[PDB]
Design a binder for this molecule. Structure first.
Ligand code: 3EM
Lengths: 99, 99
C-alpha cells in the first residue's frame, strides 16, 4: 500500500511471535527494536543518531511480518524510544518513496 | 519520482542560495540541516533523537527546493552527520511510502 506522511508511518509488525508497532524509516540503514527477547546467538555492534549513540545486539535471518509482508533479515535489539524498520527490510517488502 | 531504497534516499536541495545533499527521512518529524548560516531571527528548541538530544536553531517559512519541488516551512539548524528532510517538508512535495 501507498502510505502518505501527514502522520508518522507506524505499522504493525509480528516478530518472535509478538505483535508490535514500528516506524517505517527511510532514514535508517538498519532495523532496531526496543527491549524484547529474541532467540539465538547474538553478535555485538553499536549505532548512531541525532543526539549521540547506543549499544545493541544483532540477530541474523530474523523473520518479521510487516503489515503482512514477510521479510527475513538482520534485526537489532537494544534501546530506542520507538521501534524502527530500516532500509534492510524496507527493500524486501518492496517499499518505495514517491513524490 | 518513485525512489526505491536499495541505496539511501539522498537528494539535492537548494536552501539559502546554497546547494546541498540531504536524506529523505520518513523517521523524522522535523527537517534538520548541518551547520549553515541561515539569515533571519531564530527561536531556540532542542530536538531529540537516538542518543539523546542536540540543540538547534529554528527558522520558520524557510524556502527549500527538494529535487526541484518547492516547499516552505520550518527548518532547523544545529549539528548532524547528515542533512535530513523530515515529514514537515515531505508532505509538501507530495512524498509517499508505497509497498
Ligand atoms: C557509507 C557511510 N558509512 C561510513 C560513514 C556509514 C554508513 C552508515 C553508518 C551508520 C548507519 O546508521 C544508521 O543508519 N542508523 C539509524 C539512524 O539512527 N538513522 C537516522 C539517520 C541519522 C539521523 C540523525 C543522526 C545520524 C543519523 C535517521 C532515523 O530516521 C532516526 C531514527 C530514529 C527516529 C526517532 C527516534 C530515534 C531514532 N531518526 C532520528 O534520529 O530522528 C531525529 C529527529 C528528527 N526530528 C526530530 S528528532 C538507526 C535507527 C539504525 C551508522 C554509523 O555510525 O556509521 C555509518 C557509516
Amino acid at each position: 500500500p501507498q502510505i502518505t506522511l501527514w502522520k508518522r508511518p507506524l505499522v504493525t509488525i509480528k516478530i518472535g511471535g509478538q505483535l508490535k508497532e514500528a516506524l517505517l524509516d527511510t532514514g535508517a540503514d538498519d532495523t532496531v527494536i526496543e527491549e524484547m527477547s529474541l532467540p539465538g546467538r547474538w553478535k555485538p555492534k553499536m549505532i548512531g543518531g541525532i543526539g549521540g549513540f547506543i549499544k545493541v545486539r544483532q540477530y541474523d535471518q530474523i523473520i518479521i511480518e510487516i503489515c503482512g509482508h514477510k521479510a527475513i533479515g538482520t534485526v537489532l535489539v537494544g534501546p530506542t524510544p520507538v521501534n524502527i524498520i530500516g532500509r534492510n527490510l524496507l527493500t524486501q517488502i518492496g517499499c518505495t518513496l514517491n513524490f
